[PDB]
Amino acid sequence: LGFLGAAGSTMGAASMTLTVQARNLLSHWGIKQLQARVLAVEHYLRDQQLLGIWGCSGKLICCTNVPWNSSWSNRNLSEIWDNMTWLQWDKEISNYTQIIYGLLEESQNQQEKNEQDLLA
């Protein structure tokens, strides 16, 4: 039930412990420790910036408007969300991640402009 306790469980189970891992991301002799802390903070902020860009800020589960081209992974919802662990899934769609991130960014920009031109 603790940090990474769900790592060996299926994605459909592990997805319920997202707050457990989120809360464990924060917190010359002695200089290397400050350097590590600063870098840990920058890493954290970059993840938050992407969630901001994609419109997922403030939430651990975010639905989007980008579809799933089967060429990334043609497995069905059963196999992904009731067999595979997140570690195995990540090692499958590792090559096709930058593509997905780029698509998410573009979709949010289209959504922001449309919304503004509707509140006009």
């Binding site: 503004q116 031109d117 509140l119 006009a120």
Partner: protein, 434 residues
Amino acid sequence: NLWVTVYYGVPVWKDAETTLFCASDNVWATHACVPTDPNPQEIHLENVTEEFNMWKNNMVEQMHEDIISLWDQSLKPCVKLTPLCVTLQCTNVTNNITDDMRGELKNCSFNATTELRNKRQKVYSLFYRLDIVPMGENSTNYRLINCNTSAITQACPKVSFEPIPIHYCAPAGFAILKCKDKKFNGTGPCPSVSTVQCTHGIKPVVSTQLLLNGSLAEEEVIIRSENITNNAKNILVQLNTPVQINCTRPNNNTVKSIRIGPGQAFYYTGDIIGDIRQAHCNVSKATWNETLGKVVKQLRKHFGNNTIIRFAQSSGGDLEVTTHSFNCGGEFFYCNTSGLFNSTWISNDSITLPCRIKQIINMWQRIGQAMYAPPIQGVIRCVSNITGLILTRDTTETFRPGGGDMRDNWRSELYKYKVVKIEPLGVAPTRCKR
């Protein structure tokens, strides 16, 4: 009718002063340099016109600090030549010495310390006259020049002073803007500006009146000064063609060493093989005359056109500013340029410059430090490019060599770069509202 809309990620910047991080590929390019030079991306900003300024750019100061600091760090583990601040009895060198070498060298003997406290050794070595000072007016007793002021540190012989390029990269939140205007004179609007991730590598070459191994002007000689009518300012002249200079120390030296303490070895010239001749540098005469003619043509655009421009040698000051100082193969040369700046311009020969050699130098304009450069075994030859001149100014205008301050050498490379801070947040009116 209109409402305030907030935008974030707006391509706006303001001038700013921050700390830049060095990136490279022995004093220079220390372990304190992010090992990259990847593909420093250049993103031409098109229709932007930015008020560039050298003679304010703080990048000059950062580099000055950095270099001085890197230099001092390289001497931290090296031997202090303090046991050697003793009376050195000196005589003349028993060799075939030309007239230009009279007297220039002295054969000095002294009682040196050694590994064991109760042992001592007699050592003799050859010193350049410029490194020793007579004690008791005319006497055989002499002391090393810097034993009345700071202690001398021997440079570690394993460390090479050869200049290594260092790229200066912006921290996140900042950007470096580069001026691509080929005719840019250092100040004012620059119509073609691009954004770069990191500067090109700049070689921290240390020289005085003739700038060596720098960047050349793309098309024409460019004369840059903070205020051209102010005689208190230096003039940096960037050449559009190199002038090749060939320097030598044509004496085959034998280097010997002693232990002066527990793991402390001192290096010195033991003897000279062959005749004793003056060190010197060659500049092609015709090339040099063409180079000055180009400089004169450009000076006449700031000064009267139907005028007279005269060149002369530096008028005074110490050896550090009256000569052309440079590091050639590890030795420190002080060359006399009066043979280069002796002409008046009104509306396969070569020039040979005599050079003095010193082993005890101060490098930076400081009082509290002194360094001993170990002598180098064999015969030294180096070839370098003159890429610019540092001039000062007195009808008829007269120009003389300058260059005492190091910041000016670095300005000749950093003049095209500016550091700005990105300010991504801002507002503008739109017809939209919550």
